[PDB]
Amino acid sequence: IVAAVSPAGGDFSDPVTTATLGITQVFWGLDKKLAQRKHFPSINTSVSYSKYTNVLNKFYDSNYPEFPVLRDRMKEILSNAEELEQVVQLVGKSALSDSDKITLDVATLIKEDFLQQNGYSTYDAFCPIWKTFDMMRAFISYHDEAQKAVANGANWSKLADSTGDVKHAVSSSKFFEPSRGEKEVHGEFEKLLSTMQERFAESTD
Amino acid sequence: IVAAVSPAGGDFSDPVTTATLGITQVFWGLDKKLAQRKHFPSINTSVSYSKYTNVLNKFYDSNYPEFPVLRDRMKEILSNAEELEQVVQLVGKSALSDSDKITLDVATLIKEDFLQQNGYSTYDAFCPIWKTFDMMRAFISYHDEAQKAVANGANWSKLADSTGDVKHAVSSSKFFEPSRGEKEVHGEFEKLLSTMQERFAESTD
Amino acid sequence: IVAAVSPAGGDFSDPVTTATLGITQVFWGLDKKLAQRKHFPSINTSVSYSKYTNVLNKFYDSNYPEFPVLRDRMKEILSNAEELEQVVQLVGKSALSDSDKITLDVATLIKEDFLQQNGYSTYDAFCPIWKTFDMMRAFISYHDEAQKAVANGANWSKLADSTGDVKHAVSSSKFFEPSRGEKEVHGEFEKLLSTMQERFAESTD
Amino acid sequence: VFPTRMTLGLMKTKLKGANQGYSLLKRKSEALTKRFRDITKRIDDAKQKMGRVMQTAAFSLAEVSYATGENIGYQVQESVSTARFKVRARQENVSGVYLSQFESYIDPEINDFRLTGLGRGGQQVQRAKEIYSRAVETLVELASLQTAFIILDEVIKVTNRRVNAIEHVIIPRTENTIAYINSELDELDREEFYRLKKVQEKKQNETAKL
Amino acid sequence: EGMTRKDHGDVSNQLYAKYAIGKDAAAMKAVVGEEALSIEDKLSLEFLEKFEKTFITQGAYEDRTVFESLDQAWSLLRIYPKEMLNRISPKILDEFY
Amino acid sequence: EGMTRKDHGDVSNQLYAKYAIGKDAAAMKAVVGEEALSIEDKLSLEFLEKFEKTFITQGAYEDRTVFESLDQAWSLLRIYPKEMLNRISPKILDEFY
Amino acid sequence: AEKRTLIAVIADEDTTTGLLLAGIGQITPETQEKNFFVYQEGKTTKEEITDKFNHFTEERDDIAILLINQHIAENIRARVDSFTNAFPAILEIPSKDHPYDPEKDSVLKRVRKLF
């Protein structure tokens, strides 16, 4: 049951959203201003909850890789990006450390890869769960490789320019359909997982 | 029909003020900040609107008008004076240029002389179109002469303090009834253009 | 009638607290940090006010008070120290003079001796008017002797170390019994005034 | 002008963002306020130390030039075409703002000149220049932080005025508008229930009789 | 097809995103100032002033075409780089760039 | 009393003060940068992530007690030195680090 | 970045001769112009210090540190106090035959208020 809600009393806290949020079990977001800015289908990453994530992630942990840790890390990166955006906007852009630049760069690629959509199903509008977890695993491995490379001594522009085709191929993974792989996952993300590890040593030096 | 209104609920979002203001075609608002300075009424482009000013300017411009450019320039400088005063009040006078300070200096004298219409005598109660067009033309000519003298090499405090009683005589020419000159245009407003033009040449060199 | 006024409905503009605050002529505030600081009540100089202090000073001064002269001087030292704390924080620690350190040091000992009470002994619950009257005169004479001694040439730490047990005994004067002079007057303040007058000559030289 | 129903949600986030920006501006103003005096003390000692160290080397060079006769200090100044102790600019992030730093460098292109040996006075001229270079290196190294102190002293006045202006102008309009919006929403919510109860009493009064 | 283009939906989302970025940076530029604003906020601030006095200003008797409105929107949207535009597809954005 | 130690009430002020100082130190580290961060804000910033990742996160089938919570609070507060802990008594701080 | 390597000085011939002997500033070999101001005690006017300090501080941009005497900077305290920029930074130094004072520094006046 997927029932869309809307305001009906002239406020954002009416009894329809109060009874619908209490009677429902999943919380999905929606922004008309974000959808008008070429961000549809947009969703709220700070206000949402689901009870079937553990039960659906239990069979997905055995029959697939650890998508549940990448979902919590992807939610934590989007939660930290909103906190870093206020300090970057208020205090200034060239006043932050190099640690927040990797989280903002991973949050921009995750928001551009997941939040970015075009049309209904045109231009590769289909995405499986294994392709989404494999696409998020390259972003989490690239963010962990950039955060681990920046901790051992490395410039921010040297590592961001040292990424190169990894960020363009990871950001451009929304146009590759499932025909490239077998039925669910794409082999280019599996080769890109080793390509990110091979590019992680070149990105540090 | 000219009917004034007041706030019954204490705000400007009530149905009495919005109902009478919505059905009306002409509006003349009152600012509390300009009303606190002993100036009533005080509205340039934020609480005042009129659709018949275009057809109304055809006859007054048909006789001997200059109000067609000075009204849009005075409404633009009066509308920009609040935006310059907001950033000048919030941040300070360090993020603004000399053109905004000269425009705020002309908007201060134009708002002080144009907003004050209470009158302290019998000659300060009538306001002809020739006196307001001559005062607005002298203020626009002084504002253009300050920008031209600042562009040719000069200071803002040397321009305003260099003007002094040249603008003070134009601001002080509202306490006498019009009985000099041709019919309503006295020689003090006619000599103010030659005095401001003579002071503009000495202000440059 | 001492009735507390708690919040109702999560607002501060209701007519319960506003009507009770506007109808009453005496106020005594309470702070959460003041209750944790062992302060009873939690209002130093800006959380409490009273309009009947003129009649209460006329009656308590009618019996045998000397609180009428030091009443404004007692709150003036706390208002001077509280006004000097913001100038010391914002302006700088080295911007204050030697009189502000003696006034803040006298207000700290007067606030710690008078306002600092948690019922440690049997003399901290019941307090007579004679000990509170002589306690303000001892701090006023110590502040006047410290300012007059510092005005004739001296250091702040040399003046406080020159005072020593004279200023330290006033903070520990609340621990002594209230039956010092007859049954209610503190006899340590009468000899402490002449001891502070004799110590004022040694504090300057 | 403003809304009449559900308008406190923007004022709550605006007040929270104004409080977070006031807290960050207070932290940056505290860090710049500590670094300003922290550089001001070392600049205050280095001014007198560089003044005495420059006065001693100036007195020794004045004594050597006065003892030499026919002082070639104008010729030594005209004969010099290259420097030995140089400086390099560098940006250092301290408290959020970019400060100017100086790095001393040794130039091995010119150590001795054509006026360092002429006779008996050349040993006194080289003896004065040998202490003059050691005093000049400590003078530049002590005078390096003046651009950073002058930058922090200029930044702190803008930061304190911005934090005081935003913190002074933030909360009261949104709180005073939100309270009147909540009271107007409460009265507007009460009037429709009062009219429906007034119609419901006369509606139930007819059914209560029969 | 035959009466409109395909890049109008991406150009409208890019113009709405640039107008939202310029309108969002315009309110924050008054409080803090021009000392903490980057070049991205200045590009949206200049694009809001350039598109505000060009697209919103029109006559009362002349009717502008959709192709002239998309061509005028492409000129106002052509102030930033090609890599800084992400509200359109790369195939349609590369052809109409 | 009988199942809870006397230092549990005193350790909550040091843990809440360390988490409250680390919450402001997390934004202060991004605001000031990497060359203006104090050691007290860095130790509270690491104690906020270490105490947040070990004191507030737990499973769905595990169990905790007062002695395990006091030992976990002492282990989380053991990262700081003895000169930076001043929100408790010296006997409880010297007895349990 | 590296956009300033020379050090300017405005003092007497003895301090400028010693600082030129140890090496601080020199003449650039692309224009034939010196980067220092040799002032004479009681033989030079005050109008040359404003043109030399204005030409060295506002006309030239390759100077990293601009030195100034106490007496010569005290006679030019209007233009010296009016220049509060850090590029190039101004450092108040004591002149020959004069003692060090805390009122002859432009950075001390603005550094005193708003500490």
Structural domain boundaries in chain G: 1-115
Topology (CATH) of D5-207: Helix Hairpins (1.10.287)
Residue D190: left (phi > 0), alpha (psi -120 to 50), or beta? alpha
Backbone angles phi, psi at G68, to 5 degrees: -150, 145
Specify the pairing of strand D85-94 against strand C48-50.
Answer: unpaired
Chains that touch A (3 or more CB pairs under 8 A): D, E, F
Q: Would you state the structure tokens that stand for residue G60, as one six-digit string? A: 């030239």
For residues B156 and B99, what is the distance between their CA atoms, to the nearest angstrom?
A: 9
Grouping H, G, I as helix, E, B as strand and the rest as coil, residue D89 is: strand
For residues C173 and C189, what is the distance between their CA atoms, to the nearest angstrom?
A: 9
Specify the pairing of strand C26-28 against strand C48-50.
Answer: antiparallel
Which of A79, A83, A86, A54 has the alpha carbon at shortest distance from A67? A54
How far from G114 is each of B93, C88, C91, F56, CA to CA, in Å? 18, 11, 6, 44
Give chain A's largest Cα–Cα span: 59
Residues belonging to chain E with any Cβ–Cβ distance to chain A shorter than 8 Å: 10, 13-14, 16-17, 20, 28, 32, 35-36, 38, 86-89
Chains that touch D (3 or more CB pairs under 8 A): A, B, C, E, F, G
How far from E55 is each of A38, E3, E4, E64, G87, CA to CA, in Å? 20, 21, 19, 10, 44
E and F: touch, per 3+ CB pairs < 8 A? no
Q: Is C160 exposed, middle or buried (0-12, 13-18, 19+ CB in 10 A)?
A: middle
Beta bridge partners of G37: G10
According to DSSP, residue G9 is labeled E
Which of B10, G112, F28 has the alpha carbon at shortest distance from D180? B10
For residues E14 and E11, what is the distance between their CA atoms, to the nearest angstrom?
A: 5
Answer whether B92 sits within 8 Å of D161, measured CB to CB: yes
Type and span of the H or E element at B25 = none
The answer to whether E64 and E2 are in contact (CB under 8 A) is no
Backbone angles phi, psi at D131, to 5 degrees: -85, -25
Give A66→chain E minimum CA distance, Å. 31
Which of C75, C67, C68, C73 has the alpha carbon at shortest distance from C47? C75
How far from F97 is each of B164, C98, F15, F50, F81, CA to CA, in Å? 75, 43, 13, 16, 9
Q: Which chain D residues are within 8 Å of F35, Cβ to Cβ?
A: 92-94
The answer to whether G86 and G107 are in contact (CB under 8 A) is no
The answer to whether C106 and C77 are in contact (CB under 8 A) is yes
Q: Does D20 touch chain A (CB under 8 A)?
A: yes
Q: Which chain A residues are within 8 Å of F29, Cβ to Cβ?
A: 97
**Interface size between D and F, measured as CB pairs under 8 A:** 31
Disruptive mutation site among E15, E89, E94 for chain A (greatest number of A CBs within 10 Å): E89
Please tell me what resolution, in angstroms, this structure has.
Answer: 7.6
Give C91→chain G minimum CA distance, Å. 6
Q: Is C146 exposed, middle or buried (0-12, 13-18, 19+ CB in 10 A)?
A: buried
- Residue A17 CB neighbours (<10 A): 16
Q: Is D109 exposed, middle or buried (0-12, 13-18, 19+ CB in 10 A)?
A: exposed
Give D191→chain C minimum CA distance, Å. 18
Grouping H, G, I as helix, E, B as strand and the rest as coil, residue D92 is: strand
Give the relative orientation of helices B67-90 and B129-151 as an angle to the nearest 10 degrees. 60
For residues C148 and C165, what is the distance between their CA atoms, to the nearest angstrom?
A: 19
According to DSSP, residue E11 is labeled H
Backbone angles phi, psi at G33, to 5 degrees: -135, 135
Domain range annotation of chain D: 5-207
The answer to whether A69 and A128 are in contact (CB under 8 A) is no
Give D177→chain B minimum CA distance, Å. 10
Q: Which chain D residues are within 8 Å of C90, Cβ to Cβ?
A: 160
Grouping H, G, I as helix, E, B as strand and the rest as coil, residue C169 is: helix
For residues G91 and G96, what is the distance between their CA atoms, to the nearest angstrom?
A: 16
- Residue D15 CB neighbours (<10 A): 18
Answer whether E31 sits within 8 Å of D166, measured CB to CB: yes
Residue C71, CB-side half-sphere exposure with 13 Å CA sphere: 14
Beta strands in C15-123 (DSSP E): 26-28, 48-50
Give A57→chain F minimum CA distance, Å. 15
Nearest CA in chain E to A93: E38
Residue G23: left (phi > 0), alpha (psi -120 to 50), or beta? left
Q: Which chain D residues are within 8 Å of E33, Cβ to Cβ?
A: 162
Residue G47, CB-side half-sphere exposure with 13 Å CA sphere: 0
Give F97→chain D minimum CA distance, Å. 31
The answer to whether B142 and B174 are in contact (CB under 8 A) is no
Answer whether E32 sits within 8 Å of D158, measured CB to CB: no
Give A85→chain F minimum CA distance, Å. 11
Q: Which chain E residues are within 8 Å of B86, Cβ to Cβ?
A: 30
Residues belonging to chain A with any Cβ–Cβ distance to chain E shorter than 8 Å: 33, 36-38, 89-95, 112, 116, 118, 123
Question: Mind giving me the DSSP string for D94-113?
Answer: ETTEEEEEEEEEE--S-SS-
The answer to whether A91 and F29 are in contact (CB under 8 A) is no
The answer to whether D28 and D157 are in contact (CB under 8 A) is no
> Which amino acid is present at E24?
D
Which of G59, G41, G63, G61 has the alpha carbon at shortest distance from G51? G59
- Residue G45 CB neighbours (<10 A): 9
What residues contact A60, with CB distance under 8 A and at least 6 apart?
A67, A68, A129
User: In 3-state terms, chain F is what percent helix, strand and coil (to 5)?
Assistant: 60, 0, 40
According to DSSP, residue C58 is labeled H
CA angle centred on D25, ends D20 and D26, rounded to 5°? 95
Specify the pairing of strand D97-106 against strand G6-12.
Answer: unpaired
For residues C116 and C34, what is the distance between their CA atoms, to the nearest angstrom?
A: 10
> Which amino acid is present at F85?
L
What residues contact D66, with CB distance under 8 A and at least 6 apart?
none
Beta bridge partners of D86: D105
Of G5, G19, G92, the CB nearest to D136: G19
Superfamily of domain G1-115: ATPase, V1 complex, subunit F (3.40.50.10580)
Q: What is the dihedral of CA F90, F91, F92, F97, to 10 degrees?
A: 70
For residues C17 and C10, what is the distance between their CA atoms, to the nearest angstrom?
A: 12
Chains that touch E (3 or more CB pairs under 8 A): A, B, D
Q: Would you state the structure tokens that stand for residue D12, as one six-digit string? A: 């709550």
Q: Which chain D residues are within 8 Å of F36, Cβ to Cβ?
A: 31, 35, 93-96
Beta bridge partners of D89: D102
Q: Would you state the structure tokens that stand for residue A10, as one six-digit string? A: 């002239």
For residues A183 and B112, what is the distance between their CA atoms, to the nearest angstrom?
A: 76
What residues contact G11, with CB distance under 8 A and at least 6 apart?
D58, G19, G37, G39, G67, G68, G69, G72, G93, G95, G96
Nearest CA in chain A to F60: A54
Residue D60, CB-side half-sphere exposure with 13 Å CA sphere: 21
For residues F34 and A101, what is the distance between their CA atoms, to the nearest angstrom?
A: 13
- Residues in chain G followed by a break, C to N above 2.5 angstroms: none
Answer whether D76 sits within 8 Å of G89, measured CB to CB: no
Type and span of the H or E element at E14 = helix E8-31
According to DSSP, residue G95 is labeled P
For residues F31 and A97, what is the distance between their CA atoms, to the nearest angstrom?
A: 8
G and E: touch, per 3+ CB pairs < 8 A? no
Q: What is the dihedral of CA C94, C98, C100, C106, to 10 degrees?
A: 130
The answer to whether D155 and D36 are in contact (CB under 8 A) is no
Answer whether B13 sits within 8 Å of D165, measured CB to CB: no
Of B13, B90, B91, the CB nearest to D2: B13
